[PDB]
């Protein structure tokens, strides 16, 4: 692609600069370029990839919800047309991320930390497709499958306070609540995740304790909304 002539290290440096500049579309394109070099990503590089596309799709999701709400209240073709424009661009970003994961991040990821990270992302970007889907069932089952494989590996291979495991459970629980229409499964997962992490905090350093409790607080926030 357009980044094929730039060094991998330069793409990573510029992704970090684009983050500082809040230039997340640039950040995402630089990290896409880095992935397409074909080498595995480090922990820091995986986080750069995720932060970039989360910011990009986050703006599109927020736009889509504004337009969808206007559209629903309005029910001329303009509101529908422009909602469809934004929806199509959002689906394109999701398709791009899923393509990176499938070609070939997931298959080359052998360590639990990398494989769970990528399978969580796969679940997330199928979930974002599900939010706009109206084939919705197949999309939902693809999110569930990715999340479920990530959970199984995380439960075998990672401590219950591991931040990737915690963020996976948080997002899978939200999937259950509002995509799968399984609010009891959502609440159950969030509770069990919070409680098993609480009982393992005593093993952690001050810095790891801060990392884990920050995501535990998100689980708590959702439980407060849900119960």
């Amino acid at each position: 692609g357009a980044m094929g002539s730039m060094e991998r290290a330069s793409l990573i440096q510029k992704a970090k600069l684009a983050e500082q500049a809040e230039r997340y579309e640039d950040m995402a394109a630089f990290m896409k370029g880095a992935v397409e070099k074909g080498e595995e990503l480090s922990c820091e590089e995986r986080n750069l990839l995720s932060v970039a596309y989360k910011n990009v799709v986050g703006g599109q999701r927020a736009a889509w919800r504004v337009l969808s709400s206007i559209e629903q209240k309005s029910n001329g073709p303009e509101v529908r047309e422009y909602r469809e424009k934004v929806e199509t661009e959002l689906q394109g970003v999701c398709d791009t991320v899923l393509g990176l994961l499938d070609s070939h991040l997931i298959k080359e990821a052998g360590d639990a930390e990398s494989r769970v990270f990528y399978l969580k992302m796969k679940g997330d970007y199928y979930r974002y497709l599900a939010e706009v889907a109206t084939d919705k069932k197949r999309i939902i089952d693809s999110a569930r499958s990715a999340y479920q494989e990530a959970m199984d590996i995380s439960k075998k291979e990672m401590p219950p306070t591991n931040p990737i495991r915690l963020g996976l459970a948080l997002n899978f629980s939200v999937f259950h609540y509002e995509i799968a229409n399984s609010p009891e499964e959502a609440i159950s997962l969030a509770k069990t995740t919070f409680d098993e992490a609480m009982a393992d905090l005593h093993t952690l350093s001050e810095d790891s304790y801060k990392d884990s409790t920050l995501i535990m607080q998100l689980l708590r926030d959702n439980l407060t909304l849900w119960t």
């Binding site: 932060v51 989360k54 910011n55 990009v56 969580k120 948080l170 689980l219 926030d221 959702n222 909304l225």
Partner: peptide
Amino acid sequence: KLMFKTEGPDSD
């Protein structure tokens, strides 16, 4: 749309 907490940047 009430949005619940998910991992990483609350970008939406």
